[PDB]
């Protein structure tokens, strides 16, 4: 199927308390593979998956250089942002960045992304055509004018359609066994009396990958949303995810309800009944 590569970075100014903190992580699909922390003593792009360890010291030098340089650019960007908005140096501000590409199954380009948020809000983004920019506000108009004049979009598109998709293909091989794997949910159902009049029916999805999943409840083969709780899909800590869905059910009714479970790893959907 499709695959994605992403880099996520976060700069946080620390007013009165030294230089900004810079953390960047890289992901292929739902798996992390590298990290860099400005405060760490090693000062290098470190490996965060087994399949990236088979890379030469050229790789680790190039990537260290590039990430270390981006930290300085964003460090300066925070100073620029303050002045643009005339904001007190006393307050801490955050700058986040998303970068990456999507490929189809055949390995070809599908999509590219480059975008920035200032204090949790959209700041600037490369549009899908990868030729133009969306500024969020007057402050980002200034940035966007710079970037047009300098032709950042042309550089980014070339990287996005080439070096990124190539990089992605390459990664999907080196960790073929971690990355092209599909782990189906191990599913089950529990039951918790609340009153002698009501009960909680809880439907579980466990040790699955990738993270996308759908859990539904049904009363007599017909959908139900009333009195249902659906927690957020969560990391297990081993490269797999968990999720659960519950319904409050009046006593004696338990068997009118079914749980439905859809995941790429299931050859066929699952139906669970108490």
């Amino acid at each position: 199927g499709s695959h994605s590569m992403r880099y996520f970075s976060t700069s946080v100014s620390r007013p009165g308390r030294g230089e900004p903190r810079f953390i960047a992580v890289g992901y292929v699909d739902d798996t992390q593979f590298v990290r860099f922390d400005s405060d760490a003593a090693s000062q290098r792009m470190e490996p965060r998956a087994p399949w990236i360890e088979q890379e030469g010291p050229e790789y680790w030098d190039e990537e260290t250089g590039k990430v270390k340089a981006h930290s300085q650019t964003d460090r300066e960007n925070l100073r620029i942002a303050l002045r643009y908005y005339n904001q007190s140096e006393a307050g801490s501000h955050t700058l986040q960045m998303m970068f990456g590409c999507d490929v189809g199954s055949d390995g070809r380009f599908l999509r590219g992304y480059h975008q920035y948020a200032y204090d949790g809000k959209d700041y600037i983004a490369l549009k899908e055509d990868l030729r133009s920019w969306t500024a969020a506000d007057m402050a980002a108009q200034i940035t966007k004018r710079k970037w047009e004049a300098a032709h950042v979009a042309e550089q980014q598109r070339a990287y996005l359609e080439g070096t990124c998709v190539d990089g992605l293909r390459r990664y999907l091989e080196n960790g073929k066994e971690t990355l092209q794997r599909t782990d189906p949910p191990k599913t089950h159902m529990t039951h918790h009396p609340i009153s002698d009049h009501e009960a909680t029916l809880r439907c579980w999805a466990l040790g699955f990958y990738p993270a996308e999943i759908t859990l539904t409840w049904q009363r007599d083969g017909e959908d139900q949303t009333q009195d249902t709780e659906l927690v957020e899909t969560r990391p297990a800590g081993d490269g797999t995810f968990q999720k659960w869905a519950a319904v409050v059910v009046p006593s004696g009714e338990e068997q009118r309800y079914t749980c439905h479970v859809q995941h790429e790893g299931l050859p066929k959907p699952l139906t669970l009944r108490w």
């Binding site: 890289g26 981006h70 550089q155 070096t163």
Partner: peptide, 10 residues
């Protein structure tokens, strides 16, 4: 493949 960020100045 970390992006080339040289031109990303605000």
């Amino acid at each position: 493949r970390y992006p080339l960020t040289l031109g990303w100045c605000f």
